[PDB]
């Protein structure tokens, strides 16, 4: 049925984040509220294009933008960050309700050195009007042409010519 | 007297007590200090497999922070 052409191995070398889950989830909200610009249009690319291959250009940017956020903490209160994310992992659910004191310590540090405020409840869960440059695909499913529907029935009803016309029956 | 129930029932207080100690201690031992990560849904399992894959040493229970990121 054809060619399954896919991107080469050349473009699949991004500076992959080397962190673990706990440190990923320890920041989470601040990372989500400070790196939304590359997240939104890339995810919008994932939905609109309906194909992973066409969103490689945005796929690397979100990973790259993560590093700029991540190393920004290293030049700042990363020691409170280490104490935080090294206390989250100890819980099996990776739950924040048991690490509230370090939640404050990370928040109070990031509040003034950088200014990333704590996202209020429900703020992340919000549809956003992400600006984009790419035009919308003409057919995201690459749908082919459509069969022409059968001609529509019309015309005023007329009495059945010569009645029932079934064997000898008339009228 | 009635206190003679205590050392006979204390065996239960030892029998039904070490399984929790065995599990809890080995959970910290098998998973290296931290308790075993639970995955009741596919998202948590995807997190664990990512942690195991990123570990390099190929264990989910060893985590790396900002030190690798340069």
TrEMBL record, chain A:
Disulfide bonds join 45-55, 77-109, 87-99. Residues 132-163 are annotated as: Disordered. Keywords: Disulfide bond, Electron transport, Mitochondrion, Repeat, Respiratory chain, Transport. It is found in: Mitochondrion intermembrane space. One of its GO terms (biological process) is mitochondrial electron transport, NADH to ubiquinone. Residues 145-159 have a biased composition (Basic and acidic residues). One of its GO terms (cellular component) is mitochondrial intermembrane space. Belongs to the complex I NDUFA8 subunit family. Complex I is composed of 45 different subunits. Accessory subunit of the mitochondrial membrane respiratory chain NADH dehydrogenase (Complex I), that is believed not to be involved in catalysis. Complex I functions in the transfer of electrons from NADH to the respiratory chain. The immediate electron acceptor for the enzyme is believed to be ubiquinone. This is NADH dehydrogenase [ubiquinone] 1 alpha subcomplex subunit 8. It comes from Sus scrofa (Pig). The lineage of its organism: Eukaryota, Metazoa, Chordata, Craniata, Vertebrata. The chain holds residues 78 to 248 of 248 of the full protein.
Automatic annotation (TrEMBL), chain B:
Keywords: Electron transport, Membrane, Mitochondrion, Mitochondrion inner membrane, Respiratory chain, Transmembrane, Transmembrane helix, Transport. It comes from the Eukaryota. GO terms for cellular component: mitochondrial inner membrane. The keyword ATP-binding does not apply. The chain crosses the membrane at residues 1-18. It is found in: Mitochondrion inner membrane. Accessory subunit of the mitochondrial membrane respiratory chain NADH dehydrogenase (Complex I), that is believed not to be involved in catalysis. Complex I functions in the transfer of electrons from NADH to the respiratory chain. The immediate electron acceptor for the enzyme is believed to be ubiquinone. Complex I is composed of 45 different subunits. Belongs to the complex I NDUFA1 subunit family. This is NADH dehydrogenase [ubiquinone] 1 alpha subcomplex subunit 1. It comes from Sus scrofa. The chain holds residues 92 to 161 of 161 of the full protein.
């Amino acid at each position: 049925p054809g060619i399954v052409e896919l991107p080469t191995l050349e473009d699949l070398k991004v500076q992959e984040v080397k962190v673990s889950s706990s440190v990923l989830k320890a920041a989470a909200h601040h990372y989500g509220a400070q790196c939304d610009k590359p997240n939104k249009e890339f995810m919008l690319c994932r939905w609109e294009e309906k194909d992973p291959r066409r969103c490689l250009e945005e796929g690397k940017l979100v990973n790259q933008c993560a590093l700029d956020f991540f190393r920004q903490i290293k030049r700042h209160c990363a020691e409170p960050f280490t104490e935080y994310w090294t206390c989250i992992d100890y819980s099996g659910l990776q739950l924040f309700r048991h690490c509230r004191k370090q939640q404050a310590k990370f928040d109070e540090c990031v509040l003034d050195k950088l200014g990333w405020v704590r996202p209020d409840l429900g703020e992340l869960s919000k549809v956003t009007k992400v600006k984009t440059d790419r035009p919308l695909p003409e057919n995201p499913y690459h749908s082919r042409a459509r069969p022409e529907p059968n001609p529509e029935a019309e015309g005023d009803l007329k009495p059945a010519k010569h009645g029932s016309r079934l064997f000898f029956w008339t009228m | 007297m009635w206190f003679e129930i205590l050392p006979g029932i204390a065996v239960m207080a030892a029998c039904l007590f070490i399984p929790g100690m065995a599990t809890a201690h080995i959970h910290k031992f098998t998973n290296g200090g931290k308790e075993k990560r639970v995955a009741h849904f596919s998202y948590q399992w995807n997190l664990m497999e990512r942690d195991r894959c990123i570990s390099g040493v190929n264990r989910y229970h060893v985590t790396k922070g900002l030190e690798n990121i340069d």
